[PDB]
């Protein structure tokens, strides 16, 4: 392949002959690395010598980036970097430009070569000339960050940190200068934008990411986009711009040196107007920056305290109305105002604690207890979205003080909402959202507080190791996680989206036991949505790199949970389990022994589980010779015993007979399909014995095309069954016809 790649590199006008096309495609999908890099090197040399007519094959090229090799990915990066550097204006560049930053964290070498690749590609000093090159560089960066929003932003900021750490000394600071040479130009772009809102929000997200990485630049340009925060239309992208600029000021105002007091003041008041005249999301994302700027330098928190007092008095009026008038129509008129009050009090509890000696300024009334009790009272309401708003306020207030969930009635709130097969689906979504967010802020605050250890190092003691400050975060899961387990058995899939996100971030923090939720994680590795099973298998292999036998512990439980999952819904789904466990002979042998004996001998299980077990069994991708031989041998043993007994009992002699005969028929059909698919002589099957020699039956299996006739026939014989019981003559004729088929299968060789 390497040589003929050089041949076709000399003469590109030959890549049309069909058999060599089949060969090069087969070597693209060959089961070895070196052929894959040779073939992709061929295609890349064709692309560089012939830019046109290769974009039809660009989809295969871009799917060859992820090949679990070492040099194959280096080669494809070289190819795509040269594609990017030689022809601009290709229609699928930026989407292309997404995918490899997704692989920057994969290995150390890829991290490097991609970093200087993009640094030469993008982050060069670029002296004061050639404005248009800088201009469409900015354009390309904006298109990249705009296409970045759907999947996730963490990869590119991680790249930014990779460049940041790469230059620990001065080294002229080549990207760093260029970095500021970028950002003001983006501001200049905004300065010339002046009017299409997608490009605006892409630019503000570029500024957002630059604020995330390090906030040292935008200290001079804050007043330039100050008029843009003030007042805009009722469009959603404008709201996102408002949230984003609130985050950006939240970062940059603490760093900027000696600010104007009236500037922060007028920002404060205009953003409270933005609170009182807009929706909830902007209110949250901006009360974050209000809490920051109020509790960061200035001291005018009495005005915000009075605003809290106003909302508290309003909600006190509403609850006092509802004390004696649960059916009052005055509450419906200001019901969205009540919702806004709930969000406001939750947010004011969220950002910082106002139950302090300076915010109250008087004798302690413990207003946090009163507000949580009142939110408990408002939680028990007849309408549904008010309870949604109550749970929102619960989570937001719970952010600041985690010990508040330790109270019993809070636990009662969760387990009564989530269990009992609640009619409302939304309330589960918001409470799981609260849990996921909760994990997110606590992770972020402990990570940031790790960074500034030196500023707090000498005002804290040794003999204690304050750990309940961390322990409570762990401890709360032992109150409810088991409840969350039956939360997994829900028909709606946003429920399982949030539940998997919660448990994934939990074990990412790992304050819980690993192998307690694995059969659930196994089961929802069989989900229709790719992200779900993606995170599920990812977490499974994350444990597998670290603990060996743990998934081997949870073997049949995953099968039963999977059956429950496909009840909730109404090739092998659990094949990735086999893909991981293919190494060890003993444990895989034990698992198949346990399966085939226990679920096929005496246990009066439902036929449908065994149907999908055999479906997976025939649809697991097996790699070497011995495993189907062992399957067929123990099948022959158990089948001879059970079939002889069942046929002699029926000859002596029945819905139970119908069910056990259906299971035996299932075993016959699985055996027959496997024996056809392996394409092996039945005499060698007769000759085989378990554990003869390890090195004899290691040969590569051939899989033939269109053999999968087991699921159709099993579905036919199950629709013949349907667990039906009736006294017709036709069911007796079906029984005797299946008995004759049993005699035939008994008589086969």
């Amino acid at each position: 392949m390497k040589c003929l790649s050089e041949v076709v590199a000399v003469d590109p006008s030959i890549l049309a002959r069909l058999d060599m096309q089949r060969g090069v495609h087969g070597r693209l999908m060959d089961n070895s690395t070196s052929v894959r890099e040779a073939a992709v090197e061929l295609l890349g040399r064709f692309v560089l010598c012939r830019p046109q007519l290769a974009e039809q094959y660009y989809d295969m090229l871009i799917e060859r980036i992820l090949d679990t090799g070492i040099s194959v990915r280096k080669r494809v990066i070289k190819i795509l970097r040269d594609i990017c550097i030689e022809q601009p204006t290709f229609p699928k560049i930026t989407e292309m430009c997404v995918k490899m930053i997704r692989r920057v964290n994969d290995e150390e070498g890829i991290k490097k070569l991609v970093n200087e690749t993009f640094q030469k590609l993008w982050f060069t000093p670029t002296p004061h000339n050639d404005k248009e090159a800088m201009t469409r560089k900015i354009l390309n960066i904006t298109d990249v960050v705009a296409a970045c929003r759907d999947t996730g932003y963490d990869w590119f900021e991680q790249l930014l940190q990779n460049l940041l750490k790469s230059e620990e000394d001065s080294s002229y600071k080549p990207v760093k200068k260029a970095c500021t040479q970028l950002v003001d130009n983006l501001v200049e772009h905004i300065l010339k934008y002046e009017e299409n809102s997608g490009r605006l929000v892409a630019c503000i997200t570029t500024l957002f990411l630059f604020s995330k990485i390090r906030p040292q630049l935008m200290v001079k340009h804050a007043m330039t986009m100050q008029p843009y925060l003030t007042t805009k239309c009722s469009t959603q992208n404008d709201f996102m711009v408002i949230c984003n600029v609130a985050k950006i000021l939240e970062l940059v105002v603490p760093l900027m040196e000696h600010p104007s007091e009236t500037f922060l003041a007028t920002i404060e008041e205009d953003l409270m107007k933005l609170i009182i005249k807009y929706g909830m999301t902007v209110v949250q994302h901006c009360v974050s920056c209000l809490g920051a700027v109020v509790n960061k330098v200035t001291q005018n928190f009495k005005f915000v305290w009075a605003c809290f007092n106003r909302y508290y008095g309003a909600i006190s009026k509403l609850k006092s109305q509802h004390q004696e008038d649960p059916n009052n129509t005055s509450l419906l008129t200001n019901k969205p105002a009540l919702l806004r009050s709930l969000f406001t009090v939750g947010a004011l509890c969220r950002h910082f604690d106002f139950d302090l000696e300076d915010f109250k300024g008087n004798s302690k009334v413990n207003i946090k207890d009163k507000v949580l009790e009142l939110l408990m009272y408002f939680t028990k309401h007849s309408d549904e979205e008010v309870q949604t708003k109550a749970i929102i306020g619960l989570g937001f207030a719970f952010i600041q003080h985690p010990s508040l969930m330790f109270e019993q009635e809070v636990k009662n709130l969760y387990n009564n909402i989530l269990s009992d097969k609640n009619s409302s689906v939304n309330l589960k979504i918001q409470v799981l959202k609260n849990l996921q967010t909760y994990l997110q802020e606590e992770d972020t605050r402990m990570q940031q507080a790790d960074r500034d250890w030196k500023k707090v190092a000498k005002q804290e003691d040794l003999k204690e190791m304050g750990d309940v400050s961390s322990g409570m975060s762990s401890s709360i899961m032992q109150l409810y996680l088991k409840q969350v387990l039956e939360a997994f058995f829900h028909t709606q899939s946003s429920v399982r989206h949030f539940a998997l996100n919660v448990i994934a971030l939990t074990l990412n923090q790992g304050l819980i036991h690993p192998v307690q939720c694995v059969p659930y994680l196994i089961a929802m590795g069989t989900d229709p949505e790719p992200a779900m099973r993606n995170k599920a298998d990812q977490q499974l292999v994350e444990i597998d790199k670290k603990y060996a036998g743990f998934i081997h512990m949870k073997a049949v439980a995953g099968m039963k949970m999977s059956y429950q999952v496909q009840q909730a819904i109404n090739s092998a789904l659990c094949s990735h389990l086999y893909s991981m466990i293919r190494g060890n002979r003993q444990h895989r042998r034990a698992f198949l022994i346990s399966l085939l004996n226990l679920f096929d001998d005496t246990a009066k299980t439902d036929v449908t589980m065994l149907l999908y077990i055999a479906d997976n069994l025939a649809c697991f991708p097996y790699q070497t010779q011995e495993e189907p031989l062992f399957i067929m041998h123990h099948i022959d043993i158990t089948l001879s015993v059970s079939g002889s007994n069942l046929l002699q009992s029926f000859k002596e002699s029945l819905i139970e007979f119908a069910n056990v005969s259906q299971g035996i028929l299932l075993l016959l059909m699985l055996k027959q399909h496997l024996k056809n698919l392996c394409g092996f002589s039945d005499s060698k099957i007769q000759k085989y014995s378990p554990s003869e020699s390890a090195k004899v039956y290691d040969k590569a299996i051939n899989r033939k095309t269109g053999v999968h006739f087991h699921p159709k026939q099993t579905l036919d014989f199950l629709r013949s069954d349907m667990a039906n019981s009736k006294i017709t003559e036709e069911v007796k004729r079906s029984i005797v016809k299946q008995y004759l088929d049993f005699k035939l299968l008994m008589e086969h060789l």
Binding site: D19, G26, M29, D30, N31, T68, G152, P530, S571
Partner: peptide, 18 residues
Amino acid sequence: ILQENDFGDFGMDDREIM
């Protein structure tokens, strides 16, 4: 000809995460 390969890409499907 398709002699030495993987069954589809099922052996080769490490997916992207968030």
